[PDB]
């Protein structure tokens, strides 16, 4: 996260670290959506252009964390993956369209002060809150500059008008993406960066005072560049896929 701040303790209890077993490194963010399901970006698991194609056994998820590198004894829980599901129409060949994936945990994680699921939006919540100007929140342990944080970082960023998103890049933008970030004339700054991808863009509904995951940190061109914006997977648009997977392969 560029130009963010240290998270408060328990501020993002759905935040998950995707962690490579060997060598031991942070791959991506992710989020806890139930006791056995974790949401992340498909490109965190599968990206053929870079010979990335992880299996379940290559990976761990670390839940309840604050410190990036410390093993947080008695706080964090580490879970093994039962099964990975990648969206069938995830477009790694072109523009990361449908950059979403689910991970089913071998066993349910226990909720606690530090571990708790975020909500997925319903159609009305999306309609109501996914508006230009409305701010969401992005969290992660990625780089501080286009170095690395001691603890989980947080930044609030406004959703951006679709024509402006489109006009900022040569990449083809789809209805399964939205962009967020400050304009050069707005003065304030902030973005995700390397290692933040797969984590959540969340909003707090003013109607029922619950946090909803509206986006997944998907891609950008640089970090916190003037006239550029971070692009996020539109979670509500893919929710039928999410629900299908969980209905069929969940217990």
């Amino acid at each position: 996260i560029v130009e963010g701040s240290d998270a408060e303790i328990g501020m993002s209890p759905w935040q998950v670290m995707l962690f490579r077993k060997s060598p031991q490194e942070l791959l991506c963010g992710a989020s806890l959506i139930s006791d056995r399901w974790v949401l992340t970006a498909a490109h965190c698991l599968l990206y053929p252009p870079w010979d990335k194609n992880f299996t379940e056994n290559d990976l761990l998820v670390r839940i309840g964390k604050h410190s990036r590198t410390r093993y947080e004894r008695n706080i964090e829980k580490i879970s093994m993956l039962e099964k990975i599901y990648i969206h069938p129409r995830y477009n790694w060949r072109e523009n990361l369209d449908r950059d979403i994936a689910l991970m089913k945990l071998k066993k349910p994680v226990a909720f606690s002060d530090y571990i708790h699921p975020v909500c997925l939006p319903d159609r009305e919540t999306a309609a109501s809150l996914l508006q230009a100007g409305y701010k969401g929140r992005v969290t992660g342990w990625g780089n501080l500059k286009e170095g690395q944080p001691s603890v989980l970082q947080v930044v609030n960023l406004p959703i951006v008008e679709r024509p402006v998103c489109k006009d900022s890049t040569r990449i083809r933008i789809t209805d399964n993406m939205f962009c967020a970030g400050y304009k050069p004339d707005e003065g304030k700054r902030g973005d995700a960066c390397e290692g933040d991808s797969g984590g959540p863009f969340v909003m707090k509904s003013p109607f029922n005072n619950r946090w909803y995951q509206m986006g997944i940190v998907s891609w950008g061109e640089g970090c916190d560049r003037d006239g550029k914006y971070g692009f996020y997977t539109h979670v509500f648009r893919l929710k039928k896929w999410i629900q299908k997977v969980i209905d069929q392969f969940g217990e």
Binding site: K21, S22, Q24, E25, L26, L60, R68, T69, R70, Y71, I78, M80
Partner: peptide
């Protein structure tokens, strides 16, 4: 770079 995690997890 990262602190050693318990080996039960690996």
């Amino acid at each position: 770079d990262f602190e050693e995690i318990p080996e039960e997890y690996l």
